[PDB]
Amino acid sequence: DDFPLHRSACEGDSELLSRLLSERFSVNQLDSDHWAPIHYACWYGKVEATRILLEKGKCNPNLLNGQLSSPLHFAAGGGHAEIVQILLNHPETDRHITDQQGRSPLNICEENKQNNWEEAAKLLKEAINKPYEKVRIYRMDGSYRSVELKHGNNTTVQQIMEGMRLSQETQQYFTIWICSENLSLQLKPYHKPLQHVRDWPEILAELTNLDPQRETPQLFLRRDVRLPLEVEKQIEDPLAILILFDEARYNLLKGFYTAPDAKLITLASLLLQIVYGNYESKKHKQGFLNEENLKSIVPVTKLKSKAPHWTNRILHEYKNLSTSKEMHHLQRMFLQNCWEIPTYGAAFFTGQIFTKKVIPVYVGVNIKGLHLLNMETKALLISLKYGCFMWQLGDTDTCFQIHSMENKMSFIVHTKQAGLVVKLLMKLNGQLM
Template sequence: MEVVIAVIRPKPNVITQDYRARLYDILLLDSKTPPGEKVKQSKYLPMLSMNIIEEEPRELVLSHLYKITGAGESGAGIKGERAIQIPCNDQVDLRIQQRESLSRFSLFFVAVNSHDKLNKTFVDQAQHTPGFYQLDYVLEVLNNGSVNFPSPTRSLLAHLERWLHDKHSRPGAAEFLFSQRTDFRIRLTVHNPVFIPSRLAHQNDGSNISDLPTDFQMTANEALAKMLSIEKCDIVKMNPLFGSGLSYVTKANMVVTNKFWDQGIVLPGLRTPSVMEEPKWCDKYPVHDKAAEGDIDGIKALIQRGQHHSKKDSISWAPIHYGAWYGKTDVVSVLLDLGCSPNVSNNNGYTPLHMAAQKGYPLVAKSLLLHRGINVNAKDSSGRTALDICSQAPDRDRRHEEVLQYIREAQMRPSMTIEIFLMDKSSKQLRLPSGHDTTVHQLCLLMLEEFGLPQGTYLDIFTIWTCSPSLQLQLKPDHKPTRELENWNKRTVHMLAGARDEKPVLKWRRNAKISVDREKQLLHPEAIKMLFHEAYDNYINALYPCKDHDVLIFSAILFCIYFGERESSTAKTLLSNERYMKQLVPAVVLKAKGPLINKILKEYNNRDQVIGRERSTFALQKKFISHCHQLTVYGSAFFDGKFIHQTQRTPRSETNVACHIGVNDVGLHIINAQTKVMIHSYTYPEMKGWHEEEFVLEIHILKPESRSRRQQTNIMKIRTKQAGLIVNLMDKMVQMHYQSRNR
């Protein structure tokens, strides 16, 4: 079995916070590249092989960690606190079924101390360079493909994050994971003296059980036998100093009394506190404490050490609430600059602006209202805005009047808006309810309102995409579109498409993660209209490779939509116009097939049988989509890359063919970017597995069963910077179908 080790180093006070990937560092190894070789370095999780039947995994895991981090004469290696095997869940099990090689791997979580560091001298000399990296950075580059990760590391890192998130959601679980290891704590703990004989039996320093008093020997042995029989102990820890004659001081923080032990035996000097002291509020929520005091430097120092600027305390107040409540204008400004939202609310729905309005702090209100993401009309749980609370304050004075004036001026400012394009080239101008913190989910709700679509049925059918000429990305519900637009040319489009200075736009389009069966249930005219325009755009751009007969049917339907009922002679005249034909037939098909006028005209004249008697725009658009549903590639999200084709004559030589890669609920489809001809199309059952390595997407294709009955595969490769996105989408598609089959 191959053991993969996830060595996690927490930031200080991580167990008191909600899960965030940036609160952890993870150990990765980096293979060094010989000088002069142009080979991309690969980062991966440490691994070791073991025989699970004959060897104890946890001890070997910790020993291996000590070895790869600098064990030797210097003793510079890292000693982990504990090694815990992370069980597989349904998602990982599904992936194992699809790629047999992953079944060999077992993932172990190893916690290390937050102060553990790697020895620089050892790192410089190591063949496989170890290094700690912030976990959120690793997950980000894992998804965007900017750093190469082998397939086991890629799959198991995603599983690790879900496991850590689950542990934080369980009270006390994270605290246990990172508590000090038992045999490290033993040196500071007083243990039961009955275990002295078994300890001395293994000493090599000349000590002997017979050197102890007879009464002590008998009492200890009897007590040991009694406790083992009652408690069924597997491992016994003890204090090696007890009975040795050496002086030591007992320093116990907590004592658990064994009710079966003789109550007459008392260890001298040991004090048993009756109740553990609860941590003070200021220690548990240090940023909140500094915010209430107005300590700007203290806040910045805590944030740099890993504290979160928007964490809520036991009464659901964030630090900015305390700054607003106590009139600390500088605190509010600093927290806003550090990324805190001005619209964060407590359990009563109070935002910082509500508090400034109630207390009458004009400078605090002004600082908040100058922030571009402020929602001036945010309401509390009683439906009151900050303006309502300020105007109704019982102790209203001149300061409240100033706050009222600032709020009214802010309400008169033009509200922030954003333009969302539709696939028919029209657009909607939407307000940003939370300013630059507005999420995709919020915009989708506003779009549904614009078109009168019910949320329950259509909320997950359409979503926001960021699009430019070289790249189209579907955003997640919690993404903030304005931030995505800002980062597009700074990072995203260059990292995933190698392009620069492209103007991105937001589009409302079909969710690539829904199935065709789900789409067939939709009946709302506005939804059908939007689906039609997206399907038409893909069809006319030849992203839907189809047979000649399908092209003729599509053309006849489109002619009815654009030109309505026409006499045969008039229809032929319109079809003779090249500009009109380009609206009905993909340009690459027109160029390859020659004149199609007579064939399209024949289908159009026979429209009652081909299309049906219903001629409304809604019926024709629905007919167009219904015919698209029969295409294997329909509903795909498209990516760009180069198909690597190996020639038969010289297997080592290869040619790169520019292609479009479509991924949908059926499988993977590869289309020649120039000819628009389908190169390959594989359903998920036809693929054994897929992974990304050095911006190359590798697909393992199952061969038909051979005479030897041994399952064989072919490997197909596509070079693309978007390989990580493709793998991620395919994994989610398979997961979606796996869940639907088990319902």
């Protein structure tokens, strides 16, 4: 390895640097000096080399050295004003970054007094006036909150949660998830969400067989999968109720909540009361529950064949609600009906089982146990409470096995998320010592 991408950067050969990027050379590879190409470019003041690496190369502007220094330190340290301009204009830049010795870019700049250090120092000082960049944090009702990014893309989940306008009690129920259409991951407090967004094609590559160009990740506020059901039952905060509710309704409508028709009807009636208020004879009597507004109160998996024969039982239970009142009281009742549902609060993973035929399955894990849904129909294939089964990862970490102590059925789920599943099973089981 000659490290030609690195050499091209400090030599300032733009055309060479650009071509090497297209020829699939990595922008975060560290050479034998533990330096990435952006470090050479910023140390030696190669303006155009840094610009191409940040833009075409889509390099992390805060990418650390082997010795934990940043491009901004090298840029400012060498007094390369124009490169400092560029880095500060990058949306992901962490302007509160510190090196291995807790020094700021300004500290190095003012000390070394190299080149255009005076100009670089001005840019750094009046960069404090700049408003921070903002990331969108979505809820399951489709809405979102713009949160200020203190440390650019180095901003952690915990720091983002502090940016959420949530009290200490409404906050303990939720955390940040990174989710595309067909992969959802709950992040830990120390994780950096925008790095996961950045590395999303590689995350999909490790865990799924999905097309990265057909999946687009976003950040979500979502129920903590670790939240004990016994703790949730004590909840009484209106905002915390609303968020859990909207997420519950979301799972309901998509068909992830499996239950007898009586339960699904009870839920539909509660949604009618919650959305439309009290029942009135002129409005909702006949022809009211058709395809269009049935779809917002019943599972989509029941909308075609099953729901059209529920309309009268739904109207009855809806009428009885009109003859609780407050909005968060009603939504709590909804959750009360959801809590007894087997797959409530579950994280879902995708996999396959092989009957020696090939059945694609959702793998659900919650504080209750493990659950398998047929991927197309969302039908509940198997539901196992903790204590009633055991799990074991496969040789390759590409599958896992489950042993039923009573049903004595053993089966193997094939999935590249097997590691995440086994890890999560262990954690949630341990909460029940």
